[model samples]
Target: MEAIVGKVTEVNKDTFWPIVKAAGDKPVVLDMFTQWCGPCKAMAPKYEKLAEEYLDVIFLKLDCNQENKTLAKELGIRVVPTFKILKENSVVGEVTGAKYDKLLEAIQAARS
Candidate 1:
């Protein structure tokens, strides 16, 4: 994964918002999943592959089961494997579940 992706960053409550804001002009692509989400595991590699493909973006994996359980929820993440794309600290595009093609399309859409 490391070989195909730009160091995947793990985001928790203490680090999520700060990192999102600090991304500067780069869009933030967040993979929101629970520790036990099956599809989350299935899509992880593809997600990492995307990280490498888009070097100008910030890719993050955030566990939904973190201590601050509602943090992701507050971000309107209602699904187990939701891909939320944010540009300038606001959601511009999103994909629910593990469909790789849809995610790729979403990433491209969010980039603009």
Candidate 2:
């Protein structure tokens, strides 16, 4: 298993799109979650562990509750577990749930 070291950091609404868009040609993984959600908490170590395999990819987190509410609403985040993949500074893929295999697939599909 590849070790990811640090915990995923949270991104706020104010800087979400800008931060993502800035990562041109590079891959970015955003895990939008909330602490109250049991599954979200459960997936913490998985995502952190997974990050080690994607050293080139900017792995990040966005807490829909503690951070950006309005942006979350605009993004239609009605759930705690959401995934967004950005490539060439644009969102190339997205999903609304947590499934490690599927998430892995999405990352592979990201513009390389």
Candidate 3:
């Protein structure tokens, strides 16, 4: 899903945090999800809705199943549906298991 506001933007390895941070001032959620992940599939709709609903953060997507190996390796991502909040190109926190509330709390805790 595409980001409705600048607050949250969906991006991949080519369109990741550094570039996004350079674009503007906003908290970015770096999302890593593989296509075969059941949790990733389950969280897609909720994620899209949240991406639309959250006006304070950017939601970025990194498709690990497709061709995000380099990005995944670079980011040290070993699981699907990994959510990281980056403020000014530095990661503040990352959470997995598709817990939406914890994702929000973590993002809020790291917001600049």
Candidate 4:
């Protein structure tokens, strides 16, 4: 029912799994971040730009705050601003910081 494309979509525990499942073979790029994280905020616009360019990819933002603690734990998220690239329902790549170049490279690798 969700037609998310060419943009970053915000997902919570309820919507996250479903969207990932529905993504099929497309790579799902998830930004696991917290509101108070300065680096995460700085990287937000860059992530959005990538979403627009990588139309074949599903970009998602999950707020890893206390409310989403269980979900974050399940995903093995130990830090804010972690980028997880998923394909075929499993994580294929990850960038564990606000390193834009590394994130871009990871996404490029995922695409191939």
TM-score for model 3? 0.81
All candidates in order of lDDT, best leading: 4, 1, 2, 3
TM-score for predicted model 4 compared with the true structure:
0.95
- lDDT (Cα, tens digit) per residue for candidate 3, span 17-106: 566666355676777887778988888788777767767767777887556578788777877788877777777788977888898788
Best by TM-score: 4
Question: Of 2 and 3, which scores higher on TM-score?
Answer: 2
Q: Number of backbone collisions per candidate, in order?
A: 0, 0, 6, 0
> Which residue runs does candidate 2 get wrong by more than 4 Å?
1-7
> lDDT of all the models against the reference?
0.83, 0.76, 0.73, 0.91
| Candidate 2 TM-score versus the reference | 0.82
By TM-score: ranked, best first: 4, 1, 2, 3
Candidate 4 per-residue lDDT, tens place, 8-108, comes to 99999889999999997889999999988999999998999999899889999999988888898999898889999999999888899899999988888
Candidate 4: misplaced stretches above 4 Å?
none
- Candidate 4 lDDT score at position 112: 86
Evaluate residue 58 in candidate 3 and report its C-alpha lDDT on the 0 to 100 scale: 70
Clashing pairs in 3: 7-57, 7-58, 8-57, 8-58, 9-58, 9-59
Candidate 1 C-alpha lDDT tens digits along 1-112: 2331375788888898988887887888989888867899999888888777798889998898858587887888778799899988988888988878898888887777
- Minimum summed lDDT over a 10-residue window in model 1 is located at 1-10
